[PDB]
């Protein structure tokens, strides 16, 4: 009895503190306020809701023999839990979609979505989750012949619906569990091809004349497009960060970069900044097999970790409920509670595996924890 209560309280505390730290950090520093971080904030909020209102309350009901808090509390908690779970899944899928669209349509996407549009998408996903789950359960409880589950049980009565239960489960995980996979696979392919075509482009740049390069860049910049200005702004504002990576670059060819800067001394910002930030990135990430292979391996490992974690933690329920309306009483009731806990477990690891990786939170959260 002690083990069950000790393996649940610690998990709940970990999830709650992890998500609360992210939520505070998003409003504790001005550096993470970037629009790209809103999806992370929504995901952290959904995970916090799960960890603060479901894990503890489910452990309470599992420890004792019944959710004796009444027919109101049971239904309301159940609806809140399912809404939060689908909110987490939708936020993960949206993060995947943004990741895919940020590497295949760089200029177009970056220039075709600012602030409100992102908040609009997040709200749309939240509303989709709420409309899909929250209404149906309680409206069915009101419109069914009678609320007939058990005097002390809390499992949803919708579980016995071959056209609904299977349908809902598919539309909730079977679709995103494959869309995420396809999108991330395409991202891996396009980052391999990106390295290849960057190396080829860098070689051509090395062969190409410099004066023609400057003339072409100036001509392209003059015909300002909706997104070219945004790309110029991003590159110029990031340039100090890029230069820091120059030290990471080998000194074997530092003469080339120094010379290129020397001739680029004129045209201070419009040409020098972009030209250097382009040559440096090309040299550093095209290079040869030595660096390209390491980069692709690192990307693939990170992608595989992120995917596999969710895919393996969120299947202890999907398949067991797919069989449920397929093999009558095929599962042991003692096992059901394990997948139930595994879903929450996913909701716990998720902030750790999505937010810390950015490495701007990696130190900010620790500094906030130390209070200094």
């Amino acid at each position: 009895v002690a083990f069950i209560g000790i393996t649940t309280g610690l998990l709940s505390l970990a999830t709650v503190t992890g998500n609360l730290l992210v939520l505070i950090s998003f409003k504790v520093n001005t550096e993470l306020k970037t629009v790209n971080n809103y999806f992370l904030l929504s995901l952290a909020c959904a995970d916090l809701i799960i960890g603060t209102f479901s894990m503890n309350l489910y452990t309470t009901y599992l420890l004792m023999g019944h959710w004796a808090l009444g027919t109101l509390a049971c239904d309301l908690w159940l609806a809140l839990d399912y809404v939060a779970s689908n909110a987490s899944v939708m936020n993960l899928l949206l993060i995947s979609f943004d990741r895919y669209f940020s590497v295949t349509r760089p200029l177009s996407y970056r220039a075709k979505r600012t602030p409100r549009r992102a908040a609009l998408m997040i709200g749309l996903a939240w509303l989709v989750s709420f409309v899909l789950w929250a209404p149906a359960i309680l409206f069915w409880q009101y419109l069914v012949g009678e609320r007939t589950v058990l005097a002390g049980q809390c499992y949803i009565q919708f579980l016995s619906q071959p056209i609904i239960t299977f349908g809902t489960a598919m539309a909730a995980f079977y679709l995103p569990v494959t869309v995420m996979c396809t999108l991330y696979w395409r991202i891996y392919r396009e980052t391999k091809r990106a390295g290849e075509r960057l190396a080829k482009l860098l070689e051509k740049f090395e062969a190409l004349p410099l004066e023609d390069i400057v003339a072409a860049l100036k001509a392209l910049l003059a015909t300002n497009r909706p997104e070219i200005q945004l790309a110029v702004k991003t590159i110029v504002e990031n340039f100090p960060e890029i230069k820091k990576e120059a030290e990471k670059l080998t000194p074997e060819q530092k003469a080339k970069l120094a010379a290129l800067e020397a001739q680029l001394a004129d045209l201070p910002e419009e040409l020098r900044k972009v030209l250097l930030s382009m040559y440096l990135t090309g040299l550093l990430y095209g290079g040869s097999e030595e660096n390209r292979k390491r980069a692709i391996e690192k990307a693939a490992r990170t992608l595989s970790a992120i995917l596999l974690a969710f895919i393996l933690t969120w299947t202890p329920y999907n398949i067991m409920v797919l069989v449920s309306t397929f093999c009558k009483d095929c599962v042991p009731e003692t096992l059901w509670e394990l997948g139930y806990w595994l879903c929450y477990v996913n909701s716990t690891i998720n902030p750790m595996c999505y937010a810390l990786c950015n490495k701007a939170f990696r130190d900010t959260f620790r500094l906030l924890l130390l209070c200094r």
């Binding site: 740049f205 023609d212 072409a216 991003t234 690192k298």
Partner: peptide, 27 residues
């Protein structure tokens, strides 16, 4: 020249792509 400008645009697009990958720590 036209082709040169096209290549320059491709290069700047690729630079933005590398920046975007860096910002996700998914490099």
């Amino acid at each position: 020249t036209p082709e040169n400008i096209r290549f320059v645009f491709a290069a700047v697009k690729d630079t933005i792509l590398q920046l975007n990958l860096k910002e996700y720590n998914l490099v």
